[PDB]
């Protein structure tokens, strides 16, 4: 999205949930970086 | 070094005779050389004084308790440690105190204890640096180590 | 002449207890809940049950020889609710009907005088 958070109009899934998925994903990626390095 | 805290050399003058007599007391925190220490039934309430537990007001902090009168400070001797007076009997004779384990116990009021907390507190807070430091500790303690 | 007891009426909303005692509390006289009188083993709070319990208490007090009661109302724990239970009015009315003599009546419902935390999440119960 933009830099600005949420803004549920009709929107999609919960922004906090999207954020949870990305925070969990970034950690998973950080584990891939750990596997690499 | 066997004791966790310092000893204090205290001079009294011989009540039954003449001249100066030296005792070895466990040093309370905030004790100092040239401090005056008072001991007895009619002694004033102040830190490091040695008083029957019956004459403490409740919630006071004390150390060097004895399980019976004149047993000479058998309890509450380790560094930084203290007991709390938690109650005084309604018809007297007994007194209720709290051991540094947190346990409560009832002793006679007549039995003595020493106002305040034992010196060298916080000693356990520093971690043991190394095996040589552990060796130096056991060298003055007991034959007990390496502990396989 | 008159002999006075104290009728504790303890209403949990779920049931309405009638527990009458000596004026000291110590040395009780009748326990009858209201739920003891419920014969269907369901739907525990009932004005009817509270009335029957009161009639039993009155019968027992007449059997004993206590001819009058002072009433202490109490609703639940006051953290749980401030509401008096439904059958409380029934219990009171039954005592009035009984012919036992009704002295001082007081509320002793035990609400908190503070604000310490209680049951369910911060959004509350969703029921």
């Amino acid at each position: 999205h933009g830099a600005s958070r949420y803004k549920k109009s009709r929107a999609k899934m919960r922004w906090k949930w999207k954020k949870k998925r990305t925070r969990r994903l970034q950690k998973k990626r950080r584990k891939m970086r750990q596997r690499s390095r | 070094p066997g004791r966790g805290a310092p000893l204090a050399k205290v001079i009294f003058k011989r009540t039954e005779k003449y001249g100066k007599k030296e005792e070895l007391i466990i040093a309370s925190e905030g004790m100092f050389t040239g401090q005056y220490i008072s001991c007895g039934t009619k002694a004033p309430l102040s830190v490091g004084n040695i008083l029957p537990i019956g004459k403490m007001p409740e919630g006071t902090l004390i150390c060097n308790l004895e399980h019976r009168t004149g047993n000479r400070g058998t309890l509450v001797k380790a560094s930084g440690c203290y007991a709390t007076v938690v109650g005084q009997s309604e018809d007297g004779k007994k007194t209720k105190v709290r051991l540094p384990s947190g346990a409560k116990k009832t002793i006679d009021a007549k039995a003595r204890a020493m106002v305040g907390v034992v010196g060298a507190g916080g000693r356990i807070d520093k971690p043991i640096l190394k095996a040589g430091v552990a060796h130096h500790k056991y060298r003055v303690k007991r034959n007990c180590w390496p502990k396989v | 002449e008159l002999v006075f007891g104290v009728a504790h009426i303890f209403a949990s909303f779920n049931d309405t207890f009638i527990h009458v005692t000596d004026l000291s509390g110590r040395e009780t006289l009748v326990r009858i809940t209201g739920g003891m009188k419920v014969k269907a083993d369901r739907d525990e709070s009932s004005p009817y049950a509270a009335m029957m319990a009161a009639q039993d208490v009155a019968a027992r007090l007449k059997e004993l020889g206590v001819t009058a009661i002072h009433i202490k109302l109490r609703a639940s724990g006051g953290t749980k609710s401030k509401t008096p239970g439904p059958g409380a009015q029934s219990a009171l009315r039954a005592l009035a009907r009984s012919g036992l003599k009704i002295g001082r009546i007081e509320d002793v419902t035990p609400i908190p005088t503070d604000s310490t935390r209680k049951k369910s999440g911060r959004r509350g119960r969703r029921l």
């Binding site: - | - | 002999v3 104290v6 004026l23 000291s24 509390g25 040395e27 002295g103 509320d107 002793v108």
Partner: protein
Amino acid sequence: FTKKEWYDLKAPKMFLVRNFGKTLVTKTIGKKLATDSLKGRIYEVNLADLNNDEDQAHKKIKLSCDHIINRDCYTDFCGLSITRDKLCSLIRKGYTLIEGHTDVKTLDNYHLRMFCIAFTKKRQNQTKSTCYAQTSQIKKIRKKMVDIMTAEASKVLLKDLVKKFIPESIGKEIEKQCKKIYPLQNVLIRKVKILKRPKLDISKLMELHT
């Protein structure tokens, strides 16, 4: 159940009826002698029903069992509360609630804790709805209220202090001084508690009971 037996509840010389009822107590057995059961227990006494003025029904006093002979218990004073219904009623919005307290000893060595409430007066000059006092004033009133109360408690014996409580003489004295700081309204002693009521001097207790 098993048998129990009525025993009369007496009240001290200060209370007009002197007989506030009968209590049943379980029949005797070996080594536990029911005297023990009668002794020490507590009774919630509504005051009005002893003196026979319905104005005083807003208080209750607590009475403890302290001396028994045969079928008779004499009883002593142990504490005092206002009834909750009256207290809630007295509390009125738009006015200033002050409550004082102190821990105190009575001439004859009875140790108490005393709780005194006070509301600001409505008066004719308040005009608009807000009649709240300033905080500095209520602190001064609170300090003053405690000072009068501790002076009143300390002076006299226990029976006379109890006698002062009944028409609320202390509240009148508090009101007269504190009116100068700001007008007040119902200034009552909400609760009275004993801290240390003497175990010894049963003889004096019996004499006080008379």
